[model samples]
Target chain A: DRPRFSFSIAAREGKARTGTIEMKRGVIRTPAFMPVGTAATVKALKPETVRATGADIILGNTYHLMLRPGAERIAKLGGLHSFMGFDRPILTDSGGYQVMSLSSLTKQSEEGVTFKSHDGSRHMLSPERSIEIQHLLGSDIVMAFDECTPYPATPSRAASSMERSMRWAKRSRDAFDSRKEQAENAALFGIQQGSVFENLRQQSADALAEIGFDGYAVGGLAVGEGQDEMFRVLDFSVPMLPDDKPHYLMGVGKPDDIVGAVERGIDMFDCVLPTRSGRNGQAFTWDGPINIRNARFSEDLKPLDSECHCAVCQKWSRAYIHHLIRAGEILGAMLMTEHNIAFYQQLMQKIRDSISEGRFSQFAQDFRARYFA
Target chain B: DRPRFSFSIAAREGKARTGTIEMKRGVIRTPAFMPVGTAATVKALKPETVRATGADIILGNTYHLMLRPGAERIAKLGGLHSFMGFDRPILTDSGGYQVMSLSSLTKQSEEGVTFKSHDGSRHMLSPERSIEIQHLLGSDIVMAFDECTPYPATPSRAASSMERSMRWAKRSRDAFDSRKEQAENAALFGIQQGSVFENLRQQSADALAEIGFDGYAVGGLAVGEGQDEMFRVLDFSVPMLPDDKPHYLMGVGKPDDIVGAVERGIDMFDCVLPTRSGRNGQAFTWDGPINIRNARFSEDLKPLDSECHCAVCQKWSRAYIHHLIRAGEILGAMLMTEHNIAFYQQLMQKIRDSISEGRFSQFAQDFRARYFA
Candidate 1:
């Protein structure tokens, strides 16, 4: 059968490219910002509401689903698309990121990582198993299993971790290929890891390219690295990946970081900043993020963002959201998230437009000046 | 100025009447179920969603609002309608019920009640003050300040409490009448309280009728009293008020209770059953209530109720709601609430239709048998 996914660049300026990824479900315009749906649901939002915000895709966690609902049960009920009621494309992490970060009593080995869940339940996550879970979830975009190297690691430590991830990437690809029917419909992406080391990043990227994939992801940068360090790594690391496929910057970032990454040729991003920060009463806008819980907003009659036309901004005033947040109401989280997600999508749409017009540098310069001014 | 509120009956059988109440904001069909919107929101639901569930009006709490996001603050921002974005008519309690039940270090007297909040802040709730707070909220239907007598009280104690409530009802009328402009656009409702004592109920109803109001509420019945006792109280109490005015049953009730009350001449009802029970993972269906957390529902693909057409029921399956509830997801609460509120509104609509068709008795009989079966 022919490929079910393909990415084509429509326009380019500097390192930024405006493109579209054609999938059976829908077309995603890049550089795209995917809202993170950690569990099955995007907290405080309906799938339709997320779609309404212009999200072409959403990121789900293999760790959360495999633990709670069990991937087998989801497949029995028609997969994550129907399970979560999000008809658009879904990208699932390989379960390594959260398993290392959230699970307790973790032990690593050449084959896989085993850990105790918060509930004291034990489980093992390996390249083959994570691939199996992703396939069972009917993921449109499947991520290869890799260990996200923690920040502040020695160069040797980072290199060893990156080498292991490369080995696992091959295993993940082999395992994915074994599920011929599933692989025909879903695209598998490999993750690059190197903890801010250019040599290790190149080694990791080249190794992943040798194995090949539908896409490549730059992982392990935003863990705790400062923006300058992150950008420096991205500057050297991004160019090593194949240009024919999409380049995804995982678990990133603030809006400024997104602009910088796009300019450095990153085509996709997934982050909890917009959705998580929204629940905490922080709203992102053209002027930058503002905390709605502040006393000054108690009587502010304007919307969360004057430029936003989302349903939240169209119907509710800042004063009302301010009251809801302070009052600890769920609608506060819901409206804030709705507006923030819409803001992120709008930001990406503008980025795509700017790239298409061959004025991306100018757009970035103007955006930062006003956003942080 | 013309009357801001009026209630008229269109049909009747036995004691039950089918009618409509016209307010400045909208018209509410009789036997209306006013969903409780404590703290200015119907927890986990948007105002438009609540309206889409066929609710003609909603009830707000004077106690919760006066505490956080003060009533004066809401008034400054264009009142509760704009603050909560409901736009429909709102009925606010006198703050006496919660003050007596929720606050600490309480004291009662001929003038009013005094208490300390959980945070050790002292406050007073009197007839004049309650009316003032409800006016500040810009309530369309303002309840009178009356002491809600505890159930199972002695005859003498019930008599004394009923007498005090009568005196307070008179003061509430005077206080509301003094606010000429607020009263011109709003309607005052006096609450009847006698703790299920027939003689005391008669005295309380007569005292309220003497003082008069735009409407009347039957209070202190659903406070742990069995359904039989509540219907018994309604038998003696409903006919005490003039037939032309609307009859409101406060803090009531389940679907069966609402049907029984409607059959006893009640026109209005408010309860947190549907919304609150929904959050707790219980869904109201035509076959009575079902707990979505039950294992039997984990893979049940049917809607919450086959006969319901709410967005939640039309779009989601029982299995999805079951998963959400088990996972402690907020969308679970939202969808369940949407369905439950729609169920209630649908029940009210059915009752209104049955009354109009002169088949309410048959309708109620069939409903009870099937719902309980």
Candidate 2:
């Protein structure tokens, strides 16, 4: 019998586990990379093109959607997927992380968060409302509402924030459960936030286990905490969480960062590194990042990455792209963003292939050596 | 025996002729609209995509190329066709018009014009050098060196400029003679420049006719003269030019302007309105124009033109296009430019078909009604 929201581990190598998350829409392979489709777009990529790049699922932000077109409006418009013209399974994030990150006015309490939008509007985001917003957006995997325990917090402050988040997680689970199950679709994933304190991390993980979610997330990492510190937390934090549930590391970072996290037992991840860096004229190739705006590329006729199989690489030379960037043409940004997303997707595929073939560490080492060298 | 440039007068109605310019490379139908690949690119368009929009040839600017990559560089790189990756026939301008318009520091002389480029460099543009640049670039149709005859000039000033241009036309023809046999494959077009003076216009045309170029252009209108003045000039200037040679009206204008020029017996034209305006969110449709960036279009879900058959019209809607434009997407400009070019080509086809069926006057009336209404 197929478990409703289960991660069936197929293989294990040291700390890394190869598995798949069984859900209604599809089976999402573990050690998955969710390309951040913030503001309903993977930057400049089309849904079909994103899918063609081998992405199984993409992340949608509740904060942005709620502010712009509004969640209820999206539901009437046939949910996030239909509205954005993407038919693939989507995972809607709880508005907590970005509300504190991007919102103008803020008020935090045991009950919820209240903040004025950057666009000059007031809004309240409680756990129930977050779950409701996610539902309205037709999220396949709903993230439980939790405050991002600000980095560098003392152990007591971190513990308090974690305790509050756990309470909110229960409310989020209850709200999700109370809704009439539609074809038994949509699963909740609880977030663990302890601000790099091991004891708090252990407590938060245990509390999430008690609340019980379809999956778990290693939240609040790559939030300005150095990768070394994040990796240190992951060393113990991951093993404390249930192995039967999908373990996602929220905002898990650069190519190297993701590889490290995945090797440390984190199964799912999302980040804006690839897309954001692309807009900033940084092309993350297998060899390393190429800053497109550099004058050195002005007359360079080679492709951005000799190894990249993206359409931009297939047809246009670096000189042409350089000219476009200099001329400030939109095609440059579009092409760069497209290529970057493709590169990230390819990187994910390589990791997955390595794990399946039992050469995960070797692939990770090669990737690091080539990229960093 | 085949004429050097055989343009079949397939069908005619009133003063408009529906025909095709048969050449070694390909055939370009009369009333053809060439998308401007000014800087070796049609802005955001790829060569194949530009051809897909029904463009038979693209106009390349001699000034832009000669200044940046150097005409000799392009020649060494296997000519403009290979350098730009465009195989279709290219029509290159003399650099005289751009010297007059684009360069701010140009000193006119009887021998030639010495101009400071926008890139903060000085260069001389003689009739001989202009032809040489186009020749090295391997252009199919090269315009003879001539002045633009600045607007609002006295009749005598206009005549003097036109007279100098005629002298330069002679030099340009003589230069081609020195280049010897290679030019037999390349057509040299003389430009008739006389501002708004009818006598000067007649003199310029007669002088060019005597010098005998492969084709002719009524050069000086569309400078600062309003549409009424421009049409008036075309009416007299076009008829005075050689009927056997293809007559092109340089820098000639809008949809209505093209219609008027065609009715006045002009066979070819090029303008930056469609391409330049497109980059700014202004799209030319059958019904006047639509600025896609306008807030009213934010939620509007209609195509730029319902009757259009471009890739843009077929795939995306106004709302999505508006979002793209608002967010500054290159695909927005690209799609819009494609649609505008397609619209111009479609209009050209309609005019050609109207002339063939001998209902050009009716077609013109209906076009203005639909376009302006």
Candidate 3:
């Protein structure tokens, strides 16, 4: 394929490796964790601040973008990239996950899933339409339509869900190929979903490998299997995915969760943990997560982390952030989110660097020893 | 006066003047318009960002701090200056305005004002207590308690309120003197209160002059009166106050209002207009106010003010900010507030420069021509 997407292993050590996903928009360094800016804007953060925090790109939600502000409106003003004023590469998720999230009210069929929005509006999302929305938004990378496979399902249930997602993946492949824009022009990663069952994971990954895409992702692991099980799944599930293709672990968790996933050969991740925690006044620092609203921070002159070089940490003390948060100031959210996103991005960069330097295992050990009890 | 405050004539023209207020905390270059950072925070701005907008100092609310965080809490936490993480001097309102805003449920006696909190609680704010709160907050300049003299009061009502405020000013002075920590550290400013009447303004000024203060403020003019009437009150009212002490106009507003007030010899001013208007998506530009939410702005790529050098204007376009505002991003408020505050401070500097250059009349005419009609 003469398509623009390319990936190369720049360095490696053991099972863990360092790679680069080169695209027209930007070069995404390996072991990257994208902060989600679902609604075109990262919650409470400026784009530069997001980038400064080491984010290579951000994830936008197709469902949310299509609904509010509308895809057509964004197209008229400019695509999501220009509309959001972020020039960085963006990966957009298919609406399938959000559809699965509304399990109580959604109706599933081979053609697509129909669900009512939380705002009391009905919407239908299928593989073709999902790819069309992402195309319109002009994302640098996109995910294929697949069921999330709600956690704790029976092996048969997981297998059926995996088979259905693989079928949907074909439709996604057809729809993606049909775009006037070459599929290679924008990386379309197929999601590998099989719950915790190794056979299902192998089946999904092998099926996706035959259809082919720019990269692959280990999905459905972080849902509710708990971190121990998630790490266990990754221990085997990650290596099964195509080695040459970038491996993304969607919505996979906290700092330690990321370190563990990276240790298992995962190359990419996205989550709302850091940003969501920030809004709730929880800041992840080198020492540990600190709730700025706690009374102990009231008189503390230190910033969220003395080691954090983020603008918020460099400029404001913990006591000030605590006051701002307790008083319900928007600046508080902006500051905390900036710091947390930066912290996450810093962690990602550290992992990527360590992997390339052949000391990721040592780095992981040091991180946990310092950040956890 | 053995006060450490210093001033330098930068540039002056006609009645318009430019100078600086050099203080122990920092240098406030005149005509400096301090952005109101009430409740220990600028509504949507980080302290450093606020400083980056050319602001040497900011104004805090003695009323809100005393009520919510409490003076004791701030003192225990190491004063408002330290607690808020702002090293620059902070001028605090004497809680007189709080009496007007929050005292609807409290009693107003000749000695002090006791008011009920909007949160359904009782509170007392006597002049002495107001001074004490400012002291505990480590305010660089303290405003003496005075009646706002609600608009449209009868002559007798205005006279009685002015007299009562004078008596309270004596109490504020006595209370200020009792604070050993604050006595040498802070400057006490007496407020001149009167309705729109010239005689009342003179009476108020004469009374405050007898009980000398570190500075003088022209109060009770900008409440509801139109700009013309407000200017008329200032035309006569300002010259009656002592010229040696810096003349502050409390809660004085708008781009045009500031220009007119400067012509009337007001050297220092503080207002929530720039910050509050920003949160509401109203941007104060050289031409006029623009609401970013308007659909017409969806494609406008101009800086908030083409003349502004603030980072918001220098780096961001109106279209980008418009999108952010539509998405309800906190960054929108932060950027807009920063720009607006910068606009005001820059205006203050321009007026000061014009005054020093002895061409303030021409400068004021040009400013009005562009900013107003």
Candidate 4:
């Protein structure tokens, strides 16, 4: 018997939509912001705590895990859920983006990219190999292996990247559907890569739609594209993909960026900003990000987010977080991260609610006003 | 009026005793292992997590707090209890020991010790100022300012060190007693310093006895004396302190050292060994410590300690911890630290039970066997 999975839209206002992505493991709400667990931990947070922040799924980096803990090793130990003590849905990215970004001596080919790991050990991540690793991780949502094209590329380079990614996407789908047992429970999402080009994105989406994936991701936008540029791209790229399936915007972005993307019909997002900024002492509040390292917070007894009700905000004050970061305490990173990620979840919830209530446009305008104030 | 304080022995077997130290904040069971929170955060663990390990009290370092967060800042932010979020009884050490151990350009005198802070700022920790800082911290149990005499000292040097500490002891007492309102709720503890010299220890004890304190600490032994030398010193050092008051052994020790010290009459202890070793990938088990960094553990799915019932051990596996440590994830440090601290508290509980059951001698013997096996 095939394991259960479904995506049903409940409401829509203009382009924004509210829906539930029901999988065997759990239901992911629309406009979901998945915290990046680049190393299986959402950095300083426990898996349970991550779940407590109202997160249905956390994104795992295949690149990091394949290098350190190893995919086969994790499977032998009962997969990512057991290995990380995260008992909910996990979406694992194909090892294409980070392989180029984090690894050394990278070399690309139509046979798939090859590179030396940071430790100088050679590794390969062809479409087939990427699917094998994700299967070994027992991931709930598997992403197609595709190149994450850098921004500022010429149309010529962008078109080549998009074409190769489409070819890789077909291979990824074939390899994923080949796993009869693992594919029964898990869903694979295809990535659309084209740098700031409408035709290239349209072509990539057409290929992925024809070959088919359970979900579609409008990738390669947040790389260095300004918020305006990303929103402009999402204006067309998101609609090019099938509206019936979910749309995930990879590695995007600030709270405002997420707001802009959501209204343009994007449904899922993952960014290291919440956790990365948190570790460096930046906190996400309804009004926008504030550096908790600022000396003014040393005695500000208010919570990190006055409008949020996460555990970190409920129990701790800005002063305590300030003191923790100032003294280089891990708890600071933990508290900051919990609130930041929770704030994102909170943002997504509000976004979904606004969409269903037909107040998304008004809500977006208000969010920006206060955030940039 | 006195707020509340009592040391009532519940059971006794040989020099070892099981008891309770009742204070305003909480009741500390005898043979207590107070985890060290030097930077006010216990490095990677939260105060509540540290409390979950069955710890009734935690030790704070004056040297670290006073340097970075500043004592006045904590007091302004509503004291260490609120700032650190540890609601249990907190015993703050006098700044003397860490100042000598961690600070730079220390200059000692009969007046007090002066030193350059690690930040290159000048500071002094006189007996009066140390008491004042602890008061500012709103510490439940305050330690007397005393020199932590270096180990391997000549008899003359040890005698002089003990004499200066005793002199500081009286000043510390005077300063603590001077705070009519704050002193009503908080208890001041005297630190005994003789550097493994028995007669000198006795002399320091007599001086503290004459001055009087709510508690006494067996200091200066764990500096470098090794287990045998420390135990030998503890044999005589413990009995010299008043049998009525609680005796804390400062900066001590391994599990076995704790077992031996409890049998020799130390009612309390604080050490960094558990948390420190945990961050370094070493975990405390019933069968001694194991390094999670070992290659063989990469696929070993067993818990860190088979006997540990801590949250980390209950929910995570040795393989996961091994993976975490290998991957250098912060959760690894957090989980390891939580289990190690919990194990220390568990050890203390067992010790207390053994003492009360009149089988402490047998338990200690059995403990060493399994621990060293």
Interface RMSD over true interface Cα atoms for each candidate: 1.1, 3.3, 2.4, 1.1
Q: After superposition, how far is residue B236 of candidate 3 from its true place, in Å?
A: 1.6
Q: DockQ each candidate and list the results.
A: 0.73, 0.27, 0.48, 0.79
Candidate 2 chain A: 10-residue stretch with minimal lDDT: A322-331
How well docked is model 3, in DockQ terms? 0.48
Q: Against the unseen true structure, what C-alpha lDDT does each candidate score?
A: 0.91, 0.83, 0.83, 0.89
Model 4 CA lDDT for position A199? 90
What's the TM for model 4? 0.98
Q: Rank all candidate structures by their DockQ, best first, as comma-separated numbers.
A: 4, 1, 3, 2
Instruction: Provide the global lDDT of candidate 4 against the true structure.
Output: 0.89
| Candidate 2: clashing pairs of residues | none
Candidate 3's residue-wise lDDT over A158-235, tens digit each? 999999999989998999888767475787889998999988888998999999988898888777789988988888
Judge candidate 2 against the unseen true structure and give its global Cα lDDT, from 0 to 1: 0.83
Stretches of candidate 2 exceeding 4 Å from the true structure: A1-12, A17-31, A46-48, A69-83, A135-141, A177-187, B1-6, B22-26, B66-84, B98-102, B117-119, B135-138, B176-185
Q: Show pairs that collide, candidate 4.
A: none
Measured against the true structure, the TM-scores of the candidates, in listed sequence, are 0.98, 0.89, 0.92, 0.98
- Model 4 lDDT per residue over A111-222, tens place: 9989999889999989999999999999999999988888899999999999999999889988988889767889999988888999998998899999988899998987
Model 2 chain B worst lDDT window (10 residues): B1-10
Per-residue accuracy of model 1 over B253-360 as CA lDDT, tens digit each? 899999999999999999999999999999999998999999998778899999998998877889889989998888899999999999999999999999999999
TM-score: the better of candidates 2 and 4: 4
Off by over 4 Å in 1: A1-3, B1-3
Query: Which tens-of-lDDT digit does each residue in B1-373 have in candidate 4?
Result: 2246889999999999999988888989998988888877888987778888899988898888898789998999899998878887899988887787788999988999899988899998899999999999989999998888887999999998889889889999999899996678889899888887778888899999999999999888877768888889888888899999998888888898888888899899888899889999999999989999999898888899998889998899988888788877888889999999999988998999988899999999999999999
Select the stronger candidate by TM-score from 3 and 4: 4
